[PDB]
Design a protein around this ligand. Sequence first.
Ligand code: HEM
Ligand SMILES: O=C(O)CCCCCCCCCn1ccnc1
Length: 461
Amino acid sequence: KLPPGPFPLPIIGNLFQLELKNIPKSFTRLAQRFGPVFTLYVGSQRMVVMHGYKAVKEALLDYKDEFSGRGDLPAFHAHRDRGIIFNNGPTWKDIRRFSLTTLRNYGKQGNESRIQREAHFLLEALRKTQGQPFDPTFLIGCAPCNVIADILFRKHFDYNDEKFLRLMYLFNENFHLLSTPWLQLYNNFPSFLHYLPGSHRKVIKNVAEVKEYVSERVKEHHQSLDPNCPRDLTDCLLVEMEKEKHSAERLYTMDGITVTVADLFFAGTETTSTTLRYGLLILMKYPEIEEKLHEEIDRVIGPSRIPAIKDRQEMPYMDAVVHEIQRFITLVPSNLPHEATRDTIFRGYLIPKGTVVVPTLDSVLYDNQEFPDPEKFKPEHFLNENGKFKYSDYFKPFSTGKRVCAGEGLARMELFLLLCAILQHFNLKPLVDPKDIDLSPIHIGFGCIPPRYKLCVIPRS
Ligand code: HEM
Ligand SMILES: O=C(O)CCCCCCCCCn1ccnc1
């Protein structure tokens, strides 16, 4: 006995129910017609979609083990059932718990200091543009890139090095491309379409170039490994592997490790970068907000002292903007796809093993009761009428549960420390009138991709 759904047609199924440029808006339409749990078939891959905090909460927390699987994402058949993001096999639980442990120890003062170092290079690069117009995409991006780099490869990159930029280029191209209608079709009809021309070929060339670059980095680390002396997360995984040779039941291969690593790298980068990039664009739209932030920075931190995590509890306005940048932009709006590990019962309904379960996040992030006027950027969505920070259980842009984002703590510290560093030293100057900025995502699918723009940064000191 399944959840309500539209009458699915042969082979295509429910395709017609969805606008491919805007799946999330199409899920919300379905939420009115059929309620907070509904059944879609696309391909003949059956999926269950939950809408609204109540229904999204339950699915993620109440039925933890049941929905802890990873729905199939064919663009990433080079990552599939290895690593962490894209993996549905029995190899998942142990790689995830171990990578989590490792991050937390590299992370505690290590993350604050690491991020803090990186901001010196970031600011230098922003100064360097000598107040003239620049696309921030591959400037602001280098900062979260380096941070995940040093954790992963103890490697640090200059801002103009060829390969660095090429990695960032691929990260960005795949994200744009994975948010286009053409890719959405690819994702549910992979065997009809895979071998045809079109930009799934590009997204796949690119997944491979990234895996190849990482591959080489993991072999480099083999060949000069001091087992006594990890230098980065790569070594720790190599080390977990060597402790595991005398065992026919293998839970790490060179392959296993290169994927864990690629996952962390591209997620460690593209994710923070998009957020930051969409944050600056928002703040050029609302000059009054950017200015309230300058006053609070100058009052609590002053012209020059480096920003720290301890400054957060003391800046309730920044805290609400960093929260609202994330809330408003709904970076991953349909979440990452879950799947039923087991046949299960949800509220009243049957969900078979192998059903893709979509616990949609923008429906939570955009609750009309939690956040009146959810369509508007409004810092006071996280402030009592009293100027103090207002916590929300509805702030789930990292999801929650057995598969909660592995990079949460890092990302959150990044958006804060970095936004702070940026605005302390510069003001934003756009090249169009604040009134004229479209803040709407240009591509909506896998992520929400912001308009491409240029700006100027004007030194404060
Ligand atoms: C900056 C904003 C970020 C957002 C909004 C975000 C969001 C998400 C979301 C929504 C998921 C899906 C959770 C689920 O399966 O239910 C996810 C998974 C994941 N994220 Fe992130 N992320 C961000 C940054 C990062 C960073 C910085 C890293 C790593 C350094 C990271 C690493 C991962 C990994 C490895 C998974 C797969 C988890 C698993 O299946 O066990 N993310 N992320
Ligand atoms: O294809 C590659 O190897 C690199 C490009 C992949 C870009 C995907 C970025 C999506 C952000 C969603 N996410 C992924 C993990 N945590 C959040």
